[model samples]
Target: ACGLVASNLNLKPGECLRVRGEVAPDAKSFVLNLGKDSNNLCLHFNPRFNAHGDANTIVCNSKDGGAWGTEQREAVFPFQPGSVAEVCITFDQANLTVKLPDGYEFKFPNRLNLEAINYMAADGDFKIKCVAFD
Candidate 1:
C-alpha cells in the first residue's frame, strides 16, 4: 500500500508512540495523523520537502469535524528524503511532545480534546519501517 492506517489503538494519557520510516528521495511531502477518528484529529504532523511551494519546512495542525485547524510551522527541516526518520511521541490530555530526529522536541496542543486517539494514518512518499505505540 502507499499509506498506512491503524485503528482501535489506545494512545491515551501517559501513553507513547514510536515510528520509523523513510521518505522517497525528491519527496514532495508526507504526513503523520493521529485522531479519535479520521474526521476528528488531534495531531497532523507534516514534513514538506518542497511541497506547498516552500523551500523546506514542517507543518503541524489539528482537525475538527473534517475542518482543519490553523497551521503551525517549524523552520527546522531535519528530514532529508531517502533517509530514515524516527519519532518518539508521548502525550497527555492537553499536549503531545515529539522528539524529532534532529534532537528537537516539538510540542503541539491537543486541540481536538477527544476522549482518546484510536486511529493513526500516514501517507505520501513514506515507506514505513515500523510502528509501535501504546
Candidate 2:
C-alpha cells in the first residue's frame, strides 16, 4: 500500500517559501501532497516525452477531492540523461513560482489552501538528496 507522504513543517498562510531539491535519474514524478487525499500538487517529468527532451511538469488539482485535474508545464532546462537537475519553488499566498535548472521562471496559482499543506513526497523511482523548505 502506498502511504501518505508529507512535510514535517507546517507552512504559514501567505508566507513566502522556497523549496529546493534534486531529482534522480530513476525518478518518474514528484508529488507534493497538501494533505491525505489526491487533492494535491504533483510535478511529472519524463525524459521520454517532453519538449526540452527530459523535462518536468506541474499538475494541480481541485481541493474538493475528485479527479486530479492536470495542467502540464515545461521545465526551463533540458535535463541531461543521468545528470542531476535542480528545482526551486517559491510560494507567496496562492501564487507559486517555480525555477528550473536553467534559471527559467514559471509562475502559477496554488490549487489548494497553502495553510493546509504539511506533507510532501516524491513519487516514483527517484532519490531526493535534499529538500529544503524556507
Candidate 3:
C-alpha cells in the first residue's frame, strides 16, 4: 500500500487527463480512484516509485452503476521515474479506447452506464505533488 493526496479534479467521458506524482523509497504501490465512492472507476498502479521498479503507470476503468469493470488497454502504462506519461481515452456509448504515451492502443467494454466523472485520489506512501486532471 501507499499514501497519496489529490484535489481540484473535474473530468468527463471521451476526454482524458494527465495524473502526475512522485514515489518515495518507502513507497510500495499506488491506486488512484475516482470520486468519494469506493466502487467508482479507478486506476491501479503497482510497484511504482520503487528504485528498482517502474516509476509510474496509468490505469482506467469504466463504471457500471457502482461497480467498476476491466481497464482500458491503451490507458495502461508502465513508466519510469523522472519521466512523464499520458493516458488518452475516447469513450463511446459502449466501450472505451485507450492510448498510451508510447502510442500503443487498446480497447475495453464499458460495463458502467457512465458518461461523466469527477474527483481524484492517490494511494501510497510517497509525497505527491502537481496532481491535476485536465
Candidate 4:
C-alpha cells in the first residue's frame, strides 16, 4: 500500500536520497524504502523490470522484524522502462551508495547497521515525481 509514503525522514549519515521518477511501461518491479517503518528496513531499493526472477536487476535488501535479509544484486542496468529517472542515495554505517539513472554506480551492505533513518517508502511499477532529502 505504498505508492509513496514519507515521514519524518531524519535520514542522517551523509544524507542524500533524491529520487524523481517514472518507470512503468508495464513495469514488473519498483520499490524503495529506508528504515524505521514497515517493519524496520534499512534499505530495500529494488528495481527490476521483470519481477522476482529478475530481468533488469538491482535488488538490495535489509529488513529486521519483518525478516528478509539476504539479497544484493546489481548488474548495471541504467533503468529505462518508460523513461524519466533520477535516483541518488548515500549512506554510511557500512555502505549503501547508489546513483544510477545512467550515471551508474552501486554498492549495498548496510545490513541494518542504521545510524539514522526515518521512514520512507514507495512501491511497485514506479511513478513518483519527487522525494528529496539532502
Candidate 5:
C-alpha cells in the first residue's frame, strides 16, 4: 500500500545500498528498482510472497526503456510476512549482488552497464523504513 522514490542518488560501482522495510502481512510481492529513472532500470529486485504463481521467491531483472530483460529467480526465500527485512545491495560494472536478511547472496548482471545509478524506487505491499547508500 506504500511506495518510495529517491532521485539523483549517484550510486557508483563501489557503493552500496541498504534498504530496510516492513513487509505487509498479506503481501503478495514488492519491488525495488535502481537505475537512471523509471524508463531505464539497471536492477529490479523483487520478493514474492505468493505472487506471479511463485511462492516465496526472489526475482531479479533489468529494464531498458520500459522493456524488461530476462528474469533471474532465486529459490531461497528468507522472508516472512509482517516482519522487518533489510536488504544490502552492491554493484560493480558487470554484476550486482544482493545480500538478503539471512545473509544469502545472489548476483545479477548489470546489463545496462551503468557507471552510476541516479534513481531508485520501491513499490508494493510494504512500508519502507529507510534507504541509505554508503
Candidate 6:
C-alpha cells in the first residue's frame, strides 16, 4: 500500500511508480501501499530492515475487503541503514524492479494483479524524499 490517503495519482497502464527515499539510521522497516482506495489495497510493498523480526527482506502482498493475502518475500537487501534508494514498480507489467542508490537491482513480482493504482502510502523506518509516476 504505497500510500493510504494521498491525492490520487493515477497509476496508468504502462506507467510506473518511482519512489526515492532514505532508510533511516537505526531503522527497522518501511511500507508502501497501493490501491483503488484506502481499504481496497491492491499492493502492499513492505521493506523490512531488521524490523518485525525481518532481516533485509522485502515482502509484498495485497488486501481486499481488509483481508490481507499471503506475503511473498525476496532476500534482496540492497538498502543500507542510514542510506538512500529508489524503487520502481511497473503497472503494465507484473514486476517490481527496485533500483538501489548503488546501481544494484532486485526484481520481484507485482503480485497484486492490479492496474491503474489510484492511491498509495509509504511509511516505516524510511524517509521518502520524492515520488513520481511515469
Top of the candidates by TM-score: 5
> Cα miss at 27, model 4 (Å)?
1.7
Best-fitting candidate, measured by lDDT?
Answer: 5
1-134 per-residue lDDT for model 6 (tens digits): 34334646877766777888887889888888877766767677787877678788878787887888777887666777887888877655566555545566666555555666788778877678888877
lDDT (Cα, tens digit) per residue for candidate 1, span 33-122? 998877888998888887878768889999999999998998788888788889888888788887898799978998977677798999
In model 6, the runs with Cα more than 4 Å from the true position are 1-5, 93-115
How do the predictions measure up, each by TM-score? 0.94, 0.62, 0.53, 0.30, 0.95, 0.81
For each of the candidates, the C-alpha root-mean-square deviation to the true structure, in angstroms, is 1.4, 4.6, 5.3, 13.0, 1.3, 2.9
Worst lDDT run of 10 residues, candidate 5, spans 1-10
| Residue pairs in clash, model 3 | 2-124, 2-125, 3-124, 3-125, 63-112, 64-112
Q: Which segments of candidate 3 are over 4 A away from where they belong? A: 1-10, 42-77, 81-90, 97-103, 125-127
- Per residue, candidate 2 scores C-alpha lDDT tens digits across 43-84 of 222223233344454444334355554555544444543555
Which residue pairs collide in model 2, if any?
A: 6-119, 6-120, 7-119, 7-120
Q: For candidate 4, lDDT tens digit of each residue in 1-134?
A: 46988877888888898989898888888998888889988888888889868798888888899999887787788887877888988889988788887688877878776678888888898889987787
- Which of the predicted structures, 1 or 6, would earn the higher lDDT when compared with the native? 1
Which should have the higher TM-score, number 1 or number 5? Answer: 5
Give the per-residue lDDT of model 5 (tens digit) for 55-79.
Answer: 8888888999899999888989999
TM-score for candidate 2: 0.62
Tell me the whole-model lDDT of each prediction, alpha carbons only. 0.86, 0.49, 0.50, 0.84, 0.88, 0.72
Relative to the unseen true structure, what is the C-alpha lDDT of residue 67 in candidate 2, on a scale of 0 to 100?
Answer: 56
Please, what's the RMSD in Å of model 1? 1.4
Evaluate residue 11 in candidate 1 and report its C-alpha lDDT on the 0 to 100 scale: 75
Which wins on TM-score, candidate 4 or candidate 6?
6
Better of 4 and 5 by TM-score: 5
